[PDB]
């Protein structure tokens, strides 16, 4: 379990959280290309709706 | 119909057993009537197994309203006979009695008629398994790529 | 329900036995109540075989509370009738009586109804054997190269 | 549980048989109590065939501590009813008595429930015979030259 | 065990029969004790057919020992109930009585449990016939010229 550690210490009682966004701004977004994926399926034919619809 | 309350059901059961009626000269005490009402409630709770038993429309009184007796049972007109016959059968033990053959037969017949309609409703057929094809006869289903039955 | 305590259960059992009820002008004796409560505890421990028996929601008292009487049984509303009928049948030999056929049949029916739901729940199918192939029709199994069922 | 000693089991058995209890005006002598405790020990030793019979956790008394009565039997909560019902059945003939039908039926049911779990655990399947090949599909065995199942 | 001698076995048998016990108001009769001890010795001898019958651990008294009563029987803890129940059944006709159904059933059960382990031990399979080959698979024996089983 220790092999998955991503921070040096844990959350110990009275630690202060800091909100990093303090003034409104339009964001800029960077990523690794595989970090965001899209799942797409056709509407199931056996649905209650789409009953007699071609 | 005159048997409108749990007290009425208990009185009918006692009249069937021959213990108390309107023509008698000695009557059972209200404590005994309350005990019989509690036995009726227990019997109906045992029958109606929290929705998976025999559905009749019986209403279970709450302890917030003090007297359970005096509340309308809510049964249909066709279940009163069965309910109070079964109640007489259940509460005959208390007075060192034994319900007669006619009472027992009527109790069995009434319970059977009580569950007949529920059994007819519950006799349902499961849908097609998830591994049936719909078949090519269903051209409309074929054109929509509905090639197998969903299941569940 | 007005039956909410082990004492109410014991009183109902004694009423059904005819030992002590208002209809017989006999009051319940504390020396007969402690024995009946001990029997009820023993019967429930025998039924609920440490989790592998007839689950009823019964609450077992502890030695910390001196009077076992007065504690709520915790039984669901659909179990009390069966439980007190069985208790009456079990404690009849203490007074050297014989529970009548109606009480015996009611105890049998109630015990069966008690175990019905747990039997339905426990009627489960074992998983596929570790040596069966998954077939070539399962897209996800083919993708993950899971040619054989996990087993166990 | 309220019953925590061999004498408690014996007194419960006498209560069932109707010979003596906490309300009776006549009682049985301590020598009879000791005889009943001896019969209980003999019956438990007969059941527990040196570990090859019925396992219940009963703790056999030792002669260094004088009174066999007074020791915790060590039984689980689910075995007390069975043990004292069979004890009552066994010691009924002493008082020119006969255990009743309900007591006998409960004794049989209790003994069956006592051995149920041990029977389930003892229902084991023997390993493969020493002349059975492991098959060529058993890759690890074939590589390690375990062509045949290990005999035992 | 608190039953350690032939006298304890005889006293238990008489108590079971109701001839002499503290449950009644009779003491064990000295002349009856000797006859019961003789019957017990005969029954052990008849059971244990000089080593080819039921093995129990019973120790047979000799002419040198003055009192037959007082010697430790030597039985294991799991045979006492069977021994003294069978003894009671056998010595009942001396007093023109008849042992009750529970006593007879317990005697049968005890004798069966007594012979269970010996039957398991004697359930042994005969060796291979001397005319059976060992098969070419038995490389060691076939090289050592043991082409057939030794038998006998």
Residues of E whose CB is below 8 A from D98: 100-102
**Phi then psi dihedrals of residue A45, to 5 deg:** -70, -30
Provide CB contacts within 8 A for D56, sequence distance 6+: D44, D47, D48, D75, D76, D79, D83, D114
SS3 D54: coil
B148 inside 8 A of chain C by CB = no
Provide CB contacts within 8 A for E128, sequence distance 6+: E149, E151
* CA–CA distances in Å: residue A29 to residues A26, A36, A39, E43: 10, 12, 21, 99
Burial of E104 (C-beta count, 10 Å sphere; 0-12/13-18/19+): middle
- DSSP letters of E19-81? SS-TTTT-PPPHHHHHHHHHHHHHHHHHHS-TTSS---------SSSS-STTSB----TTTHH
B55 inside 8 A of chain C by CB = no
Q: Please give the Cα distance from E8 to D144 (Å, whole number).
A: 63
Inter-chain touch D35–E18, beta carbons under 8 Å? no
Among E143, E24, E39, CA closest to E87: E39
- Give the residue carrying structure tokens 């065939």: D49
Closest in B32, B63, B90 to C22, CB measured: B32
SS3 E2: coil
E118 inside 8 A of chain D by CB = no
Burial of E137 (C-beta count, 10 Å sphere; 0-12/13-18/19+): exposed
Q: Please give the Cα distance from B11 to C79 (Å, whole number).
A: 25
With beta carbons less than 8 A apart as the criterion, state whether D27 and D10 touch. no
For chain C, give percent helix, strand, coil, nearest 5. Answer: 50, 5, 50
Inter-chain touch B42–C76, beta carbons under 8 Å? no
Q: What angle do CA E119, E120, E122 make, to 5 degrees?
A: 65
Burial of C77 (C-beta count, 10 Å sphere; 0-12/13-18/19+): middle
Provide CB contacts within 8 A for A1, sequence distance 6+: none
- Give the residue carrying structure tokens 């929601």: C57
Closest in C18, C23, C82 to B46, CB measured: C82
> For the stretch B9-28, what's the b/e string if a residue is b when 16 or more beta carbons lie within 10 angstroms of its beta carbon?
bbbbbbbbbebbeeeeeeeb
With beta carbons less than 8 A apart as the criterion, state whether B57 and B78 touch. no
Q: Please give the Cα distance from E72 to C5 (Å, whole number).
A: 54
Among C75, C90, C74, CA closest to C37: C90
Q: Please give the Cα distance from B33 to B35 (Å, whole number).
A: 5
With beta carbons less than 8 A apart as the criterion, state whether B30 and B10 touch. no
Helix (H) or strand (E) holding B125: none
Token pair in block for residue C74: 């915790």
Closest in A42, A46, A50 to B150, CB measured: A46
B32 inside 8 A of chain C by CB = yes
* CA–CA distances in Å: residue D151 to residues B60, B147, E40: 66, 53, 48
Separation in Å, CA of E37 to nearest CA in chain D? 20
With beta carbons less than 8 A apart as the criterion, state whether B14 and B20 touch. yes
With beta carbons less than 8 A apart as the criterion, state whether E118 and E54 touch. yes
In this complex, does chain C touch chain E, defined as having at least 3 beta-carbon pairs under 8 Å apart?
no
Q: Please give the Cα distance from C136 to C138 (Å, whole number).
A: 6
Among E74, E77, E78, CA closest to E40: E74
Q: What is the DSSP letter of E129?
A: P
Q: What is the DSSP letter of A42?
A: P
For chain E, give percent helix, strand, coil, nearest 5. Answer: 50, 5, 50
Q: Please give the Cα distance from D78 to D15 (Å, whole number).
A: 19
The partner residues of C139 in beta bridges, in order of sequence, read none
Token pair in block for residue B52: 């998976």
SS3 E146: coil
Q: In 10 A of CB A27, how many CB atoms?
A: 5
Q: Please give the Cα distance from B148 to B145 (Å, whole number).
A: 9
Q: Please give the Cα distance from D30 to D39 (Å, whole number).
A: 14
With beta carbons less than 8 A apart as the criterion, state whether B21 and B15 touch. yes
Q: Please give the Cα distance from D151 to D132 (Å, whole number).
A: 9
CA atoms within 13 A on the CB side of E43: 21
C78 inside 8 A of chain B by CB = yes
SS3 C148: strand
Burial of D25 (C-beta count, 10 Å sphere; 0-12/13-18/19+): exposed
Return the residue of C nearest to B52 by Cα. C117
Q: Please give the Cα distance from C115 to C95 (Å, whole number).
A: 29
Inter-chain touch C38–D2, beta carbons under 8 Å? yes
With beta carbons less than 8 A apart as the criterion, state whether C75 and C83 touch. yes
Q: Please give the Cα distance from D38 to E2 (Å, whole number).
A: 7
D17 inside 8 A of chain C by CB = yes
Q: What is the DSSP letter of B127?
A: -
Provide CB contacts within 8 A for E92, sequence distance 6+: E17, E98, E99
In this complex, does chain C touch chain B, defined as having at least 3 beta-carbon pairs under 8 Å apart?
yes
Q: In 10 A of CB D55, how many CB atoms?
A: 15
Among E4, E5, E13, CA closest to E68: E5
Q: Please give the Cα distance from D131 to D151 (Å, whole number).
A: 8
> Helices in chain A by DSSP H: which ranges?
none
Resolution (A): 3.2
Q: Please give the Cα distance from C68 to C77 (Å, whole number).
A: 21
> Helices in chain D by DSSP H: which ranges?
6-17, 30-47, 80-91, 101-122, 139-143
Would you tell me which residues 82-101 of chain C have a C-beta closer than 8 angstroms to some C-beta of chain D? 89-90, 92-96, 98-99
> For the stretch B130-140, what's the b/e string if a residue is b when 16 or more beta carbons lie within 10 angstroms of its beta carbon?
eeeebeeeeee
Which of C22, C82, C84, C95 is the best substitution to test chain B (most B C-beta atoms within 10 A)?
A: C22
* CA–CA distances in Å: residue E5 to residues A45, C139, D53, E33, E114: 87, 78, 25, 12, 19
Q: Please give the Cα distance from B24 to B11 (Å, whole number).
A: 12
Q: Please give the Cα distance from C117 to C56 (Å, whole number).
A: 11
Q: Please give the Cα distance from E6 to E33 (Å, whole number).
A: 10
Touching subunits for chain B (3+ Cβ pairs under 8 A): A, C
Return the residue of A nearest to B140 by Cα. A54
Among B46, B28, D112, CA closest to C85: B46
**How many helices and strands in chain A, by DSSP H and E?**
0, 0
SS3 B147: coil
Touching subunits for chain E (3+ Cβ pairs under 8 A): D
* CA–CA distances in Å: residue B79 to residues B45, B59, B107: 15, 13, 11
With beta carbons less than 8 A apart as the criterion, state whether D110 and D80 touch. no
Q: Please give the Cα distance from B149 to A3 (Å, whole number).
A: 46
* Radius of gyration of chain E measured on its C-alpha atoms: 23
- DSSP letters of C65-129? SS--TT-B----TTTHHHHHHHHHHHHGGGTT----HHHHHHHHHHHHHHHHHHHHHH--PPPPP
A46 inside 8 A of chain B by CB = yes
Token pair in block for residue C51: 């989790």
Determination approach:
cryo-EM
HEC sequence for B56-110: CCCCCCCCCCCCCCCCECCCCCCCHHHHHHHHHHHHHHHHCCCCCHHHHHHHHHH
* CA–CA distances in Å: residue B33 to residues B28, B40, B67, B99, C22: 7, 10, 12, 18, 10
Inter-chain touch E78–D43, beta carbons under 8 Å? no
Q: Please give the Cα distance from D3 to D7 (Å, whole number).
A: 9
Q: What angle do CA B100, B105, B108 make, to 5 degrees?
A: 125
Q: Please give the Cα distance from B150 to C17 (Å, whole number).
A: 56
Among D52, C49, D115, C66, CA closest to C58: C49
With beta carbons less than 8 A apart as the criterion, state whether D92 and E106 touch. no
């Amino acid at each position: 379990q220790r092999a998955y550690a991503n921070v040096n210490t844990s959350l110990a009682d009275a630690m202060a959280v800091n909100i990093l966004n303090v003034k409104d701004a339009r964001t800029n977004v960077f990523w690794a290309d595989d970090a965001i994926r899209i799942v797409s399926q056709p509407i199931p034919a056996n649905h209650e709706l789409f009953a007699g619809m071609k | 119909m005159q048997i409108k309350t749990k007290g009425d059901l208990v009185r009918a059961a006692l009249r069937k057993l021959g213990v108390a009626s309107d023509a008698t000269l000695t009557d059972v005490e209200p404590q005994s009537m309350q005990d019989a009402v509690d036995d009726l409630e227990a019997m109906m709770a045992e029958w109606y197994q929290d929705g998976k038993g025999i559905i009749t429309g019986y209403v279970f009184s709450d302890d917030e309203n003090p007297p359970a007796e005096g509340d309308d049972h809510g049964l249909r007109s066709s279940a009163v006979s069965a309910v109070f016959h079964n109640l007489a059968c259940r509460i005959a033990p208390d007075y060192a009695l034994e319900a007669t053959a006619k009472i027992i037969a009527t109790a069995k017949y009434g319970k059977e008629l009580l569950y007949k309609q529920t059994a007819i409703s519950r006799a349902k057929r499961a849908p097609y398994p998830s591994r049936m094809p719909t078949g090519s006869g269903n051209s409309f289903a074929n054109l929509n790529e509905w090639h197998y039955f969903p299941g569940e």
